[PDB]
């Protein structure tokens, strides 16, 4: 609980120093992804996140220095963190969005769009054919590499990805999902 007690002092000190704060809607952002984006903004700006701070921060509202803090209490809803930056709005406005990962299927994820596999030459050895056998895709061997004959619709959109399908997708370096950091509404923007 060392950080738990510290959180009040750490939050109050940092918030006052930074004139403007960005609240960011972090949904399904991997720890590695969060670590790397920190490096881009590591030089300028500070990022802090914790469990919902509505009640604890409200105590600061009572004391006279800032009554506007109450205004943002309703805005924070769920799974959204906020970031402190001393820079101007325009340069940091859209700069943080840069970087997007391409997460492989997790054998249970729901595809937003239909996933289509085009015909072509994989270039992989003949031994890997067994994986293709389960999905039933027609295959032919050309120049000692597996060649897909005709395109086959892997899965209908909105259905959970089968465990067999997920393993195949990562090998071919094709995935529907793309994930990136998301900005929630900031200071009435």
């Amino acid at each position: 609980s060392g950080n738990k007690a510290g959180y009040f002092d750490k939050l109050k000190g940092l918030l006052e120093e930074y004139p403007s704060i960005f609240v960011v809607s972090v949904d399904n952002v991997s720890s590695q992804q969060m670590h790397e984006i920190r490096k881009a903004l590591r030089g300028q700006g500070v990022v802090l996140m914790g469990k919902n701070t509505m009640v604890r921060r409200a105590l600061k509202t009572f004391m006279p220095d800032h009554p506007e803090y109450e205004r943002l209490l309703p805005f924070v809803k769920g799974n959204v963190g906020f970031v402190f930056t001393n820079g101007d709005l325009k340069e940091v406005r859209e700069k943080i969005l840069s970087n997007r990962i391409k997460a492989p299927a997790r054998a249970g994820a729901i595809a937003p769009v239909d996933v289509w596999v085009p015909a072509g030459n994989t270039g992989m050895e003949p031994g890997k054919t067994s994986f293709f056998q389960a999905l039933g895709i027609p295959t032919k061997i050309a120049r000692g590499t597996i060649e897909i004959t005709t395109d086959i619709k892997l899965v209908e959109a909105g259905a959970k990805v089968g465990p067999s399908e997920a393993t195949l997708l990562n090998m071919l370096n094709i995935s529907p999902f793309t994930y990136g950091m998301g900005i929630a509404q900031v200071y009435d923007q």
């Binding site: 003949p126 031994g127 054919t129 056998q133 039933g136 027609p138 032919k140 004959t149 005709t150």
Partner: protein, 169 residues
């Protein structure tokens, strides 16, 4: 009780499996030999009933009547598209004018007749099998007459095309 579409899939996949071993152990010294059904290197049949067939036997038989170029029609199966549109001319992909699904040439031409003998013989429609027998002008069964049901099938298939001729060819 395999359906025609399912049966076609099994033949394809097994040929692919055999192809993988031939490809992996092929000697590079001479000959890029691989098994392809379109090349007439695969035949189908049942040893116990002594009936076997290859694509050419059906192709030439259909070539004689309602057939223009047998050799061009050789690569008319195993992929690409199969045609049954209102317009005679064939097209690529199974999409039709109204969106109805299209036939599969291997099942529609080769595999439709074979099913017909099995169900009729098992259901004891001797009159029907005789009627179908004369539709393609099949030859008479000689000695085998009285015994019907699971005995005709070997006899009718042997008369329709004996395995030995296909093997030698």
């Amino acid at each position: 009780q395999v359906t025609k579409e399912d049966l076609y899939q099994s033949f394809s996949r097994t040929i692919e499996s055999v192809n993988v071993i031939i490809s992996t152990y092929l000697d590079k010294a001479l000959g890029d030999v691989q098994v392809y059904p379109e090349k007439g290197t695969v035949a189908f049949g049942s040893g116990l009933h002594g009936w076997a067939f290859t694509i050419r036997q059906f192709a030439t038989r259909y070539a004689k009547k309602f057939g223009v170029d047998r050799n061009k029609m050789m690569e008319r199966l195993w992929g690409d598209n199969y045609f049954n549109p209102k317009t005679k001319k064939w097209t690529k992909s199974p999409t039709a004018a109204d969106g109805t699904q299209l036939e599969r040439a291997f099942c529609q031409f080769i595999l439709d007749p074979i099913f017909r003998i099995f169900n009729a013989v098992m259901n004891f429609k001797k009159d029907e099998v005789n009627t179908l027998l004369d539709k393609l002008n099949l030859k008479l069964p000689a000695e085998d007459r009285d015994k019907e049901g699971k005995q005709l099938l070997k006899a009718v298939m042997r008369t329709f095309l004996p395995a030995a001729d296909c093997l030698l060819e």
